[PDB]
Paper text:
Insulysin (EC 3.4.24.56; also referred to as insulin-degrading enzyme or IDE) is a zinc metallopeptidase in the M16 family that has been extensively studied because of its role in cellular insulin degradation and amyloid beta peptide catabolism. IDE exists predominantly as a dimer in equilibrium with tetramers and to a lesser extent monomers. Crystal structures of human IDE (hIDE) complexed with peptides show that the enzyme consists of four structurally related domains that adopt a clamshell-like structure enclosing a large central chamber.
The E111F mutation greatly reduces catalytic activity while maintaining the ability to bind substrates. Interestingly, though, a difference (Fo-Fc) map made with the rIDE-E111F data in the absence of added substrate peptides revealed two regions of positive electron density located within the central cavity of the enzyme consistent with bound peptide ligand. One segment of difference density was found adjacent to the active site of the enzyme in domain 1, and the second segment was found in the structurally equivalent region of domain 2. The second ligand, located at the vestigial active site present in domain 2, the distal site, was modeled as a seven-residue peptide that is also positioned to make a number of hydrogen bond interactions with the enzyme. Both peptides adopt an extended conformation, aligning along the last strand of the central sheet of their respective interacting domains consistent with the usual location of substrate peptides in zinc metallopeptidases. Additionally, the side chains of Tyr609 and H332 and the main chain carbonyl of Gly361 may make hydrogen bonds with the peptide backbone. Posttranslational modification of this type for polyhistidine fusion sequences of proteins expressed in insect cells has been noted previously. The conformational change induced by peptide binding seen in this study suggests that allosteric activation occurs by destabilizing the N- and C-terminal domain interface.
Author numbering:
A (entry chain A), B (entry chain A): 42 to 965, 978 to 1011
The structure:
Amino acid sequence: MNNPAIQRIEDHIVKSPEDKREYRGLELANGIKVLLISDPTTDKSSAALDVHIGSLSDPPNIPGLSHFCFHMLFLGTKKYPKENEYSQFLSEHAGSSNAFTSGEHTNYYFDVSHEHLEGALDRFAQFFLCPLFDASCKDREVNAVDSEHEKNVMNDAWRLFQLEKATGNPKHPFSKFGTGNKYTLETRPNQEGIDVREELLKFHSTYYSSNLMAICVLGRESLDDLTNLVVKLFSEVENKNVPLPEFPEHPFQEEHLKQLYKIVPIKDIRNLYVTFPIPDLQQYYKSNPGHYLGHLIGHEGPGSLLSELKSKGWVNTLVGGQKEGARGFMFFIINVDLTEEGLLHVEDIILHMFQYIQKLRAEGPQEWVFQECKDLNAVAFRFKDKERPRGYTSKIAGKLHYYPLNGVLTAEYLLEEFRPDLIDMVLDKLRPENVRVAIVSKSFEGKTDRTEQWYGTQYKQEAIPEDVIQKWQNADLNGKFKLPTKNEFIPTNFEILALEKDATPYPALIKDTAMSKLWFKQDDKFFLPKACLNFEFFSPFAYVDPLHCNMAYLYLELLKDSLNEYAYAAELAGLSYDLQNTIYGMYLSVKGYNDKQPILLKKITEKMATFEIDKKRFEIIKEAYMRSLNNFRAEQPHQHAMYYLRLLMTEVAWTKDELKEALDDVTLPRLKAFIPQLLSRLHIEALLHGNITKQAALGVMQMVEDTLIEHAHTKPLLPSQLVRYREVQLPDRGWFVYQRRNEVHNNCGIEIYYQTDMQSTSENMFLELFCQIISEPCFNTLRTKEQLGYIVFSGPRRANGIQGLRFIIQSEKPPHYLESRVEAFLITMEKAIEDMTEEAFQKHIQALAIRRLDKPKKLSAECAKYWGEIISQQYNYDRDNIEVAYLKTLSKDDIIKFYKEMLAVDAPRRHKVSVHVLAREMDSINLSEAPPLPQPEVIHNMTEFKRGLPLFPLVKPH
Amino acid sequence: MNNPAIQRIEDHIVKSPEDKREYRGLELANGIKVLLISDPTTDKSSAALDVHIGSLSDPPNIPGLSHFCFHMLFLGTKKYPKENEYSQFLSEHAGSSNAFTSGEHTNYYFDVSHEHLEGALDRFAQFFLCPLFDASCKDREVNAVDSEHEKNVMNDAWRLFQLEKATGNPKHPFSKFGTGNKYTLETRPNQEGIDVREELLKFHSTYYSSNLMAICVLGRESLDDLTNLVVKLFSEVENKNVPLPEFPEHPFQEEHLKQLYKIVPIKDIRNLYVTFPIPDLQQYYKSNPGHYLGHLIGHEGPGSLLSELKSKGWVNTLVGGQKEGARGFMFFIINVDLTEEGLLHVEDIILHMFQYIQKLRAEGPQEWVFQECKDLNAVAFRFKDKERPRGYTSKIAGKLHYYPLNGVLTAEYLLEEFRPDLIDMVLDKLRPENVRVAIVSKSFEGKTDRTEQWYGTQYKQEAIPEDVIQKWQNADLNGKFKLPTKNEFIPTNFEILALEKDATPYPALIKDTAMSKLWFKQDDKFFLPKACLNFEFFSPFAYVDPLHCNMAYLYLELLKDSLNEYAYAAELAGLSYDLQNTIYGMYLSVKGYNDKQPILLKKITEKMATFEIDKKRFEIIKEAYMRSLNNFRAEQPHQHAMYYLRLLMTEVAWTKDELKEALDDVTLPRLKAFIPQLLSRLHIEALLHGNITKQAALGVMQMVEDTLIEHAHTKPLLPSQLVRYREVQLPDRGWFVYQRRNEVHNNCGIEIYYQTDMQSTSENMFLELFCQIISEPCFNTLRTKEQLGYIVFSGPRRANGIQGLRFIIQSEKPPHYLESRVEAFLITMEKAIEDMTEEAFQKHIQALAIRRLDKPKKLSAECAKYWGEIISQQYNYDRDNIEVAYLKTLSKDDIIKFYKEMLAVDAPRRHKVSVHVLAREMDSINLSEAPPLPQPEVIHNMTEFKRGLPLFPLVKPH
């Protein structure tokens, strides 16, 4: 009795009781799996379509056709032939989109203003009904794919990824190159024949079948309405009845086992990768054997494996468990980072891994553990934070291929059966004869034979001698490896306290004293048994010079290091904390189930105020920290540009250079002395937010104070004597440039900042609307036409109460060229604005309003927003409504004037600075015309530079 | 054979061999004693006339007629009848003048541009040949005299002065009121008859006689030329053959002896004054018995009297020796400040004084001591720094009454005969039966019977019981009081090192390293065996908050406190040091004979780096420091205005309030810990200047470094990471006012700052020429016509690289009135400038040039100038020539424009701030017309105030 397009309906979708959203499952006649989500309060709607095809179905001759294809798909359709029609519609209706290819999945998704779902879906749908696939872009698009590849070329992580693929069976599709590039996309085709337009079309026509598609749609409309909408748009997708691809033989045969790889990294890291091929455990999701083992093998603290490897001073971090492969196969991995001593004991490290394993075989599957995991995940599922719509549908579309409708939400969180047998089964694969091991370290440089062909990775491939393998099999049992004990942090009070009648819509200041300032809000919307605790400890000794910055950093690193064992239980129990230094002191945050928060907070604070430094932990943390500062050189060029702009524009900021130099003056005695000093006098500013009462907030706040006062003898640092840092003020019509060499990448980085004025409602909305207007053109113009790089960003920059427009580009071209192109873009944008219809303008106003008003979905999102107002000392909690009201009154002329005053080449108040991060070797047409530009004043000393310019005031508190 | 006007010539004037100046003594026929000084290199000339009449010859009915008289004398003459002709001539020719009355002397002096000596002297001379004495000023002048009196009314020092006079014989002129006021000057005359115009004339005509006058004149002209000039101008002064006044009976008879006075102070101090009347020792200057005793009784360190009084924790400072009275009598005094414990032991304190005395009688005069004093003073005289001309002639004119021509220079420095007899003679007066004692302390408040009539001082007068007197006579001998030992610091190497051929005209940077920056110049002009050593130690821990400011202060106070005994010898030996904290760290300066500098510097630095705090010294220094912060409330209203402006305009500055509050958190352990921290990391910037070689400078600099590094383990604070403070930047057209209560004075204070722009050659000379032009009008208008107060100041203000115009007034009127009057003055000045002749303008340019170019006369003057360039990090050593060159190119129009841009009510870039320090009770006509003014923005929080305004850059180094 269902509509002819629908085979089967619903299933009753099993969801969390807390979840007010309404759900319905569907199976279209044409084989499409579908989940509809009705949320009547949602500000943005969203949809995702996932194709169960990826780079694994890439033809042998054209690797990356899959990736290439989704690039081409966005590029206009028969009904909507404009090349950027999709994205421009999304931009102009508060929307955004993205897409991705993995081995077996291609996932396309977007969100949009809830009032225009139908129109966003009609367009998205066309991509699966009639793509133009025209060759005017086929040639450009390749550039974007190429630089995409290029950017990741020097990225270690990606290099290792594609290196585990070539270290495997070449006649297995796993070995194929997923990303693609210009070398195998435009080029190999002409010089070997073959039309990459015809090839695309074939692929798209063999593999783009409805039987292999899943869709998820979220909107305000009712389920019935969404049903019709979906049926109408998607029911006529073409079914090709493609058998689902499968890879059951497994990419790593006995020949690839017992292998060892010495890889040379770009960054100066030391990592060890251990890998056991395993059969596909997908079908077993109701019991999850691979992650019961992952849970014990990647466990931390008391008696765990990592604990031991840490005590030998061999390893700092351990991650272990099951890893995706493709339908038919998986892997079980165990990764660790090596200390200096660790790198000399790889063999002995691994022996310990098999020793813990062996201990598992000895001990055998344990029901109480699985039972514990079961109960945590259940609560975790019930009390899951409400997700952002765009990320939810995308995740759901993917999961639709693996589970029945009624179980698409609960799958992967809820366990059921306990299965000792399945667990033993996987356990049996973890043996020396199944092991692939990979060491990454710069100590191999110059002495590698092989070049992985796509990324260029140096590396050695060798076989692990029999005796070694034999030693590992001779893995007996190390007494130390104990199992985890019952989890004390598992919460049992999920009572949601009633809303105090004195409650308020924004955080209220409930305590203003010389020692502490406490902001507090009781949750009035999410009603989950969760609380966010935020503390900012102020002390001048944290950032007073580079030596104390270093000491502040090491202190917390050392503190966290020794709390870890104890803290892991909490984390598994959905209770986490963060602790880091800042230019003002230290930041302590605790999030999660509120029930046992007070016990964790007590332990952290106690340890803070009574800490005692293990000599040995000290040198390791320091050597790591040391190596980490050096490692900054390896970062992306754009990441460097941003780092230097931040230093440049701040009255006081210590560069990594300065920190490195000062690090060698840090000894154990010095550090021991510095702690009491740091803790000697303090001011604390706090936000406590969530499922807590006023009484409970003050109580939590007292215990922090009292624990410090009694144990470290802390006394009050009056707020009035806390020195805050100002932003540097650029001179009218000035242009400064700071130029630096990057010594790894053959790409250059660039950040251009046009500083405007002190933050305020009007200045804020001028900058933000102007940015909205240019957000998609910047993308469509500088990236999708001019192909200047994979990274092309524009938008607002905020810091120290000041703001301005920034552009960020990573590119093969020289900075001065990017620079000229950006100015060229600025002119076009100005004309574009002069020549834009009023109603297009209003859509831009309306689009920015929607983004701004879009309410946080979860506590930590609402919390972070408020914490932003505290950090910045503006305390403007009602900001969003105010600014949007003001936004709605702007007119084209206002934005034009704004532009002419602040941003034009000829602006009387242009304030421009550029950071140019030069490539390794570098350096020092129909296109629109760039204006002539001034000669930059060149910065050779950030300090001299700042000393010679005035400083901004600080922003007045709201 | 001498000119008929000259009785006797010269004497051959005994002078220092080092002294290139030429001298000649004279005795005019009319009894005038005269010294001429020819200095052909002098930039400014000078003269002084001293009359041997003072407030002691004041008629009984009109006290202060003497003071009054010299006010009236400046007020125009028959030949030069313009009321301010004298001072306006001096202003317009790089000159300045002043005058003063004491008991037996009235001293008038001026300096002037060397090119216009004759014209300045002609006018000065008229005052002693034919004063108009007109009654149009007689009525105004009284105001200035009155506020003069009023200002000192709340000044403790003056109150005690006039209180020792009324505690004496009323029929002795000593008891008369010296200052005068409106109460006894305009008033008592009408209501008791008597013309204060006729009275003046009488006085002036009985006492203003040539026989009682001495003159001293310094100019470029030759001695012969000065002779004629003087004879011509002064030979016809009228001789009245007044017998020289004398007061031989003595103001304090046996009735006033054995007295005790409990005085209530304005400031919260504790002081004890012990006073022995003695006969006049003037005649005995060749042997100076009073100051051989002063030398031993006011000695400090090893075995001295003060040492003991300090160990009992009774007293911090001791000053002892002979004190001026008047021809016929003197006093020998011994003053100390009391700790809290001291005030409870006055009796026991004094007993110790007589015990030391008794020890002197026991021991008897010692030839070696007098011999030591003799030799020090001789070297001191030979190597005396060349004096500023204005202060030299004034001093010499005074000394001309007491010594023969040929000995006027050497008198009071050179000893001759040793006279055990004279010493014993004075020693015999120091006995309990001769003693007057005075205690000053707020602990007496409310319980005094008597009001000294002129100042209003509360106080009790009582007689010292017999037994007390008896106890003091029963002053035996305290073992501890040892004599001073031979003086090891007495220098013996006065060799002037040859001028290295690599020498330079300005300090050169000879050492730029992470630990130290060393500026060095070898003396190329004074050639005295003297050196100035200046060290600025930078550490952020000195001023990081109020607690560390306090600790930095106490540290140095404690350090100096324990070095004193050791240092006194040096000081007597012409070798001194200064040591104080700053917002950047600490300042150590050492000046004097270079020979033993290195031994003193070594001891100071050593002690700095190894200091150990006596518990007991600690509480005393702290209680004193504490009391001292409270005592700021007692300061002059104008002094408060200046203090608050400095806080207001500096990015970071800790108020005395903040320091007081933070002081109670300072304990001994805390302080002990803070020292190593402070010394932990340091940067040093030095100026070494004088009679030292490059090799000797570096050597001196190394020993400071090496002594710190080896003993406190100091390591380098890189200069680049030293945070310097900026000046606050006022907004265009802004007017801010900070208003505060003064709780002691019935006068209000005011400072008005019109901030201009960052310092630079042009901005500097605009402000400085404008100031020159208005310097005398401001005086003549706001003070001498409008009589707004005794304190009326205007001129340049420099701080943190910024500058502006300031006016400072202390007044009976309310701030808003002064404020209006000042603006009224500004308008007049503008018109005055528009309407001033070109050649009058040029004289102003020429007058400022002369002041600026006028070369330093001594090492520490040249040193201080250079140290100014270092402190301020501008290093503009050739400043003076540059700025004057630029000065000479300015025109009226430039100054007008300057004024219209920056200073007018209507200036588009006026930047005005006013500090108003209100009187105790207060508050919150032909006159020129004040313009309407804006409503001030009012400051209630210096901090909020600064946070809301931008900050200036720092000035670029030259």
